[PDB]
């Protein structure tokens with residue numbers, strides 16, 4: 021699983037975009053307050069999600 | 082009552098050094114430890130590293146001398162020399178901002194110390210505490226918040242050592258307000274564990290058996306847990322239990338948490354009364370009513386109250402909770418209110434022991450900006466069968482004339498020790514605004 | 525008719541990337557609305573993010589230039605910056621509001637209380653007159669107050685004096701955040717009424733703050749700006 025926090029002084033309009041992109045490839049999504057987490061995706065998928073999260077400025081664990 | 086302030090002994094440090102930010106006793110030849118956050122140490126490449134001064138009590142001029150806790154400067158980055166780059170930043174680290182001594186063990190913390198992780202060039206103020214054990218035979222480093230979690234989402238901005246305490250059995254307690262996006266954290270470790278797991282070769286060191294709180298959901302962000310720490314027996318066993326302050330926890334109302342002491346599991350919560358009152362700026366635990374069970378005191382300096390006329394003035398308040406044999410009630414048993422506008426009343430509390438020697442413990446409450454000339458003031462409240470008294474038994478004010486800069490008198494207190502040996506406890510008050518530290522003795 | 529003076533305090537932390545358009549629309553709607561009920565008024569605006577010290581911002585040399593992500597550009601942080609003094613020519617106000625850019629920061633709360641204190645105290649520089657004064661405060665985040673600065677090594681309480689140099693706040697690193705009582709006293713002395721145009725999510729906390737500060741109102745910030753506009757109208761019509 022991948023935890024994408026994005027809880028600092030960053031817009032909520034970027035984090036939401038992540039939830040869109042994750043929903044675009046048809047996989048899991050779980051949202052807590054100002055946090056999202058996606059479960060057990062793949063190797064290439066984890067690379068892609070990490071790249072997008074970095075590009076939008078979110079901290080990805 | 083019996084606290085002679087005709088001519089207190091006054092210790093003077095270097096100018097422009099915040100001498101007296103934190104004070105403590107040390108009796109392994111009794112002596113007084115004082116801090117100096119902005120002190121010019123002799124270690125190379127360090128600017129205003131800060132230090133501690135061990136003033137040996139007894140000498141006629143009590144000429145304070147510093148303690149060489151660390152002589153090496155900022156450590157070079159490994160494999161960077163293979164120009165060089167500092168792996169840490171000791172400049173303006175505020176070393177000595179918290180000094181606590183138990184037995185022959187000394188603990189001096191540095192909250193503002195920041196280091197650059199090897200993996201990424203980011204910088205984060207982890208903060209470190211140096212622990213000198215068995216007098217000064219060996220001195221170890223303790224950085225419980227310098228873990229592998231790098232950024233602010235981890236323990237990177239934890240600023241451990243911002244508050245610290247020793248328990249009865251020598252267990253070391255630290256509080257890091259900035260951990261997990263300023264959620265706060267309480268870390269605990271015995272000295273023996275630190276010594277066993279000590280390994281200076283590696284910067285990242287995991288102390289086995291360490292107790293700490295875990296990361297909570299994003300609801301509780303910016304709580305500043307661990308802003309102030311204390312100890313006391315509340316559960317009912319022989320193990321001392323932690324007390325932590327959360328000034329901005331519940332919608333900036335703040336609260337105070339009591340912990341299980343052995344598992345760090347929340348036991349009691351005490352909520353604030355007014356928004357943005359900083360309820361939890363300083364906490365203390367002592368047996369005010371002499372029942373044999375520790376009682377809680379919580380300060381809030383920014384609390385405002387309506388004047389009789391109606392104008393809202395900032396005074397500050399102190400809440401006192403008495404621990405009945407059954408349990409500790411969530412309604413403050415007694416509240417003390419300040420009387421000086423912008424006085425910051427209750428920003429530092431300290432138990433004093435049986436100063437009056439009548440069978441009840443007494444308390445001392447500071448006010449950095451009270452008094453006629455806004456120099457500072459300290460109030461001494463007595464105990465009794467009904468609890469804490471409502472009227473200040475004794476008032477202490479600085480002797481020297483006011484300067485053009487605040488004196489911050491009473492911003493750091495410590496008491497409950499028989500410094501001279503006359504059989505009564507003594508008090509020590511910090512005045513770092515003009516770099517002073519005064520000592521009052523019992524009669 | 526009564527004369528009126530209004531000053532617009534904008535938040536420009538990185539969390540405003542989703543709200544910048546709403547703030548600009550609110551500015552260009554305050555101007556074109558209050559130029560219809562009073563006919564004699566002056567407005568100006570300012571901006572703020574946070575103090576520039578060790579904990580509140582990233583002190584690494586790379587992030588000082590671009591506190592935001594590497595993809596976006598952003599401008600370096602600034603504690604407070606009075607950009608336009610009070611004036612009546614609306615074209616200047618519109619053109620200056622339309623060119624604002626966002627800035628970065630680390631911690632979620634923003635230090636707007638320094639900006640409020642400086643606006644309240646620095647009278648001649650901003651251009652306050654002996655006339656009913658209004659202050660609209662737009663924010664997407666919480667707020668600091670006294671006691672936070674001790675994290676960054678700042679312990680001197682905010683003295684409440686005017687320290688503006690070259691239309692910029694220069695004593696951010698030297699003074700603590702003002703406590704709530706200090707703001708209450710200064711606003712009550714200067715005869716300034718505050719209207720918080722905060723985002724919906726922070727409605728509760730600011731509403732509680734509305735209890736502490738006398739003669740203050742709280743609306744909501746969105747594309748439909750009508751709430752704070754009607755608050756302005758209500759405040760104007762209640763004068764006597």
Ligand SMILES: *[C@@H]1O[C@H](CO)[C@@H](O[C@@H]2O[C@H](CO)[C@@H](O[C@@H]3O[C@H](CO[C@H]4O[C@H](CO)[C@@H](O)[C@H](O[C@H]5O[C@H](CO)[C@@H](O)[C@H](O)[C@@H]5O)[C@@H]4O)[C@@H](O)[C@H](O[C@H]4O[C@H](CO)[C@@H](O)[C@H](O)[C@@H]4O)[C@@H]3O)[C@H](O)[C@H]2NC(C)=O)[C@H](O)[C@H]1NC(C)=O
Pocket residue numbers: 295296297298299301330338347348349350
């Ligand atoms: C005093 O006041 C403080 C706060 O001011 C109180 O502390 C709060 O206590 C409450 C409960 O009383 C906590 O809320 C609950 O927390 C957990 C959530 O899981 C947590 O604990 C787990 C313990 O094993 C742990 O696994 C979790 O770790 C998670 O970490 C992250 C989450 O971000 C995630 O990535 C991991 O995978 C883990 O999931 C985490 O630490 C839980 O009990 C509750 O949520 C559950 O609620 C029900 C359960 O019946 C269920 O239906 C839900 O689906 C959900 O699972 C709830 O959130 C709160 O977190 C505490 N806050 C703080 C700051 O510590 C304290 O209790 C007060 N004391 C007193 C005496 O009143």
Ligand SMILES: *[C@@H]1O[C@H](CO[C@@H]2O[C@@H](C)[C@@H](O)[C@@H](O)[C@@H]2O)[C@@H](O[C@@H]2O[C@H](CO)[C@@H](O)[C@H](O)[C@H]2NC(C)=O)[C@H](O)[C@H]1NC(C)=O
Pocket residue numbers: 109110135146148216217
């Ligand atoms: C415990 O140590 C103190 C402090 O001295 C420290 O430890 C020394 C070994 C050395 O590293 C010093 O620089 C440290 O400050 C001893 O008290 C006196 O310390 C002063 C200097 O602060 C020194 O000049 C005196 O000689 C010390 N006193 C004596 C009697 O030697 C203290 O004595 C030590 N306790 C013991 C030995 O039981």
Ligand SMILES: *[C@@H]1O[C@H](CO)[C@@H](O[C@@H]2O[C@H](CO)[C@@H](O)[C@H](O)[C@H]2NC(C)=O)[C@H](O)[C@H]1NC(C)=O
Pocket residue numbers: 096097098119120121129
């Ligand atoms: C520590 O020492 C340094 C010099 O080694 C001091 O820096 C200078 O201090 C003098 C006064 O001694 C000032 O006039 C200069 O402007 C300072 N230069 C700087 C800051 O670049 C420093 O102030 C000392 N710190 C103390 C005494 O706390």
Ligand SMILES: *[C@@H]1O[C@H](CO)[C@@H](O[C@@H]2O[C@H](CO)[C@@H](O)[C@H](O)[C@H]2NC(C)=O)[C@H](O)[C@H]1NC(C)=O
Pocket residue numbers: 331332334352353354
């Ligand atoms: C957070 O603080 C609020 C404000 O004090 C608390 O709400 C209070 O709740 C108590 C009972 O629990 C009531 O007596 C008060 O009147 C309430 N105050 C207000 C202003 O409504 C709230 O309980 C606190 N939350 C937690 C989790 O401690």
Ligand SMILES: *[C@@H]1O[C@H](CO)[C@@H](O[C@@H]2O[C@H](CO)[C@@H](O)[C@H](O)[C@H]2NC(C)=O)[C@H](O)[C@H]1NC(C)=O
Pocket residue numbers: 316341342343344348
């Ligand atoms: C404080 O912590 C101790 C340590 O966990 C708790 O003692 C435990 O109590 C439970 C029963 O409640 C026993 O099953 C455990 O074996 C005990 N552990 C030890 C080592 O004594 C104690 O209950 C906690 N006190 C509280 C919750 O107030």
Ligand SMILES: *[C@@H]1O[C@H](CO)[C@@H](O)[C@H](O)[C@H]1NC(C)=O
Pocket residue numbers: 590594595596597
């Ligand atoms: C930001 O814009 C300026 C415009 O002058 C440009 O020079 C600079 O390279 C840009 N920086 C980034 C990080 O995009």
Ligand SMILES: *[C@@H]1O[C@H](CO)[C@@H](O)[C@H](O)[C@H]1NC(C)=O
Pocket residue numbers: 653654
């Ligand atoms: C407002 O009144 C004050 C107080 O007398 C005075 O100093 C100031 O010049 C006056 N300003 C105007 C514009 O009349």
Ligand SMILES: *[C@@H]1O[C@H](CO)[C@@H](O)[C@H](O)[C@H]1NC(C)=O
Pocket residue numbers: 747748749750
């Ligand atoms: C805003 O909402 C109100 C709701 O009554 C509506 O009348 C008004 O036309 C709306 N204005 C905008 C900005 O569209």
Ligand SMILES: [Ca+2]
Pocket residue numbers: 313314315316317318319320321322341342
């Ligand atoms: Ca216990």
Ligand SMILES: [Ca+2]
Pocket residue numbers: 368369370371372373374375376403404
């Ligand atoms: Ca008791």
Ligand SMILES: [Ca+2]
Pocket residue numbers: 435436437438439440441442443463464465
């Ligand atoms: Ca007594």
Ligand SMILES: [Mn+2]
Pocket residue numbers: 029537538539540632633634664665
């Ligand atoms: Mn923001």
Ligand SMILES: [Mn+2]
Pocket residue numbers: 031032033539540541542543664
């Ligand atoms: Mn937003």
Ligand SMILES: [Mn+2]
Pocket residue numbers: 029537573574629630631632633634635
């Ligand atoms: Mn911020």
